[PDB]
Amino acid sequence: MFENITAAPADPILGLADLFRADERPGKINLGIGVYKDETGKTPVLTSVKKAEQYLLENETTKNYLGIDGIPEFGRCTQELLFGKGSALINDKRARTAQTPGGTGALRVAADFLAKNTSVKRVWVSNPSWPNHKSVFNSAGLEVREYAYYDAENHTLDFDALINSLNEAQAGDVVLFHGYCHNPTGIDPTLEQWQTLAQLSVEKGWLPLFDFAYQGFARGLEEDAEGLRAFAAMHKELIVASSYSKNFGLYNERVGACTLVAADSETVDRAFSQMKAAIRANYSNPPAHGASVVATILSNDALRAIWEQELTDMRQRIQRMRQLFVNTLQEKGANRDFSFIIKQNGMFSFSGLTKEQVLRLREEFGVYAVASGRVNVAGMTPDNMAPLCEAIVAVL
């Protein structure tokens, strides 16, 4: 049965981690996967999560199965994080959320749901976008179409091109928007652009699907939710696939949510019963650990205060590294102006390096970036800034 199975091509983001491991050189630098690193190049588990874990260890009475949709409090906390505390979606009971294995699991659950319960056949994703989007939607049977986004010459958001590209999108098409900290560009729409987009989609009949994986990494929790709320305020339907992997440093615990909003309570509930059937036929019910950690921290005032500060530290440290990167590039002889980097949000800098420059950096210098030129600024520390910038200016 398996004789003719061909080998899958390595994952552009995840297979990079394997190469780096297989690397015997001393000063290799990993600017690949989107995992936060502190000043010492470690990825510690947050103090707020260690505390919640101790609490879980003291207080859990059972490992009995959660419901298909997970921990209710987890869902309630997600809705408030996404939509706002006194939100109308919340008060009108227009939203239902299922806890899922990470944001990827939420995107998948959304895909399967749409594929088996609606008339959707096409999903629009930006160019460029997180490389695994195409793959998740293609797995559910939907096709992926691309809309213009980034202007590589000017390193800006080419809004008119975005708009004109999206004009090929039909009524009933799913259009995927990133929350904030666009992966991989770091280029995001202004709020005005978000309102323009919100009125346009309501008018063209698109179903918005938001991939929200970096809430809190640009300006703050409530601020990063602006585009999505602008949308929620005028759409009767939408789905949001959120992740707590990056903002809680809970990467391997697989914590995410897929929230579904419809016109009213009765409709969203009927629609949710199908989402649940889709979950049951996939992984059955979600893993409790990471999500009860998130529910515990979010529900406890002291624990939340500590987490928000840890998230504030992550954000500010990345901001400090961006600056250090553009300055050091200048001091090291990079004769190109990399200052556009100062203008991007999140962990990623779309460097504008060619696929061959990216190949040379890793092959001659052990510096690891995604072939697209995406670099992890959060993976940069003041100790590796110099050798890294020397490697870069040498392939330029």
**Binding site for L-aspartate: which residues?**
34, 130, 183, 374
Q: How far is the CB of 124 from its own copies (least distance, A)?
A: 15
Could you confirm whether 246 is annotated as catalytic?
yes
Residue 358 C-beta: closest distance to its own copies, Å: 21
Is 206 known to be catalytic?
A: no
What is the three-state SS of the chain? CCCCCCCCCCCCCHHHHHHHHCCCCCCCEECCCCCCCCCCCCCCCCHHHHHHHHHHHHHCCCCCCCECCECHHHHHHHHHHHHCCCCHHHHCCCEEEEEECHHHHHHHHHHHHHHHHCCCCEEEEEECCCCHHHHHHHHHCCEEEEEECEECCCCEECHHHHHHHHCCCCCCCEEEEECCCCCCCCCCCCHHHHHHHHHHHHHHCCEEEEEECCCCCCCCCCCCCHHHHHHHCCCCCEEEEEECCCCCCCHHHCCEEEEEECCCHHHHHHHHHHHHHHHHCCCCCCCHHHHHHHHHHHHCHHHHHHHHHHHHHHHHHHHHHHHHHHHHHHHCCCCCCCHHHHHCCCCEEECCCCHHHHHHHHHHHCEECCCCCEEEHHHCCCCCHHHHHHHHHHHC
Residue whose CB is less far from ligand PLP, 219 or 336: 219
Which of the residues 51, 124, 206, 246 is marked catalytic? 246
> What, of ligand PLP, its own copies, none, does residue 211 touch, CB below 5 to 8 Å by kind?
ligand PLP
Among 79, 97, 183, 247, binds ligand PLP (CB under 6 A): 183
User: Is it true that the peptide bond before 287 is cis, omega within 30 degrees of 0?
Assistant: no
Q: Which of 36, 74, 83, 130 binds ligand PLP (CB under 6 A)?
A: 130
Q: Does 253 bind ligand PLP (CB under 6 A)?
A: no
- Least gap, CB of 330 to its own copies (angstroms): 32
Pick between residue 173 and residue 226 the one whose CB is nearest to its own copies: 173
Q: Which residues contact 361 (CB under 8 A, 6 or more apart)?
A: 353, 367, 368, 369, 391, 392, 395
Choose between 50 and 280: whose C-beta lies nearer to ligand PLP.
280
Binder of residue 289, out of ligand PLP, its own copies, none (CB less than 5 to 8 A by kind): its own copies
List the single partner that 130 binds among its own copies, ligand PLP, none, CB under 5 to 8 Å by kind. Answer: ligand PLP
Question: Could you say which of 213, 294, 380, 388 contacts ligand PLP (CB under 6 A)?
Answer: 213
Choose, by CB under 6 A, the member of 256, 287, 290, 373 that binds ligand PLP: 256
Q: Which of 126, 243, 328, 372 binds ligand PLP (CB under 6 A)?
A: 243
Total residues at interface with ligand PLP (CB under 6 A): 13
Nearest-angstrom CA–CA distance, 118 and 127: 25
Which of ligand PLP, its own copies, none sits in contact with 183, Cβ below 5 to 8 A by type?
Answer: ligand PLP
Task: Find the catalytic residue in 124, 130, 194, 307.
Answer: 130
Site track 86-115 with ligand PLP (rule: CB under 6 A), x = hit: ----------------xxx-----------
Q: Could you tell which of its own copies, ligand PLP, none binds residue 128, using a CB distance below 5 to 8 A set by kind?
A: none
Report the alpha-carbon distance of residue 259 to residue 355 in Å, rounded.
37
Q: 211 an active-site residue?
A: yes
Touching ligand PLP, residues 314-373 (CB under 6 A): none
Smallest separation, CB 248 to ligand PLP (Å)? 10
Active site residues: 130, 211, 246
Report the interface residues with ligand PLP, using CB under 6 A: 34, 102-104, 130, 178, 183, 211, 213, 243, 245, 256, 284
